[PDB]
């Protein structure tokens, strides 16, 4: 019978859910995802600049394993990529002293 005014709040067709301390899966009108979960599954160039060792190890590269001729004169790199257990390491068996300390120096280069 009489004029009226109502206070109320927004609602929509959103299905986005959100979590809190007291409650889980709370459907909400608007939410922001802040976690990136996808990558291109590829090794790529970094800002127009990597040295990919393929089947060579850093030792093999620096000492000059004949099976590592690809890297006789390598250009500037952004980062370096090495396989877990490269085949072409020290072709003649032996040791590389303070090798890890040498890889570290590389990583600053």
């Amino acid at each position: 019978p009489g004029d009226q005014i109502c206070i109320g709040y927004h609602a929509n067709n959103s299905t986005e859910q959100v979590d809190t301390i007291m409650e889980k899966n709370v459907t909400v009108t608007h939410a922001q995802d802040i976690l990136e979960k996808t990558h291109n599954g590829k090794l790529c160039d970094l800002n127009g600049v990597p040295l990919i060792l393929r089947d060579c190890s850093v030792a093999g590269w620096l000492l000059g394993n004949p099976m590592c001729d690809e890297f006789i004169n390598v250009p500037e790199w952004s980062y370096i990529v090495e396989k877990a257990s490269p085949a072409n390491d020290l072709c003649y068996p032996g040791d590389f002293n303070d090798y890890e300390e040498l890889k570290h120096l590389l990583s600053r280069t």
Binding site: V18, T20, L35, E36, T38, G41, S78, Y79
Partner: protein, 46 residues
């Protein structure tokens, strides 16, 4: 890419990622979550 990981490169503006901890370049901060979503709107009614 502007951000690289041993599993692949990242093209994102998210502040967080869960791809791999060891990255190089301008990267989101790595975290072990499967999900990080902030409520911005309000509780929706069914």
């Amino acid at each position: 890419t502007k951000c690289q990981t041993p599993m692949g490169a990242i093209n994102s503006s998210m502040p967080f990622h869960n791809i791999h901890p060891l990255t190089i370049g301008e990267c989101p901060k790595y975290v072990k979550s499967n999900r990080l979503v902030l409520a911005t709107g309000l509780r929706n009614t069914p």
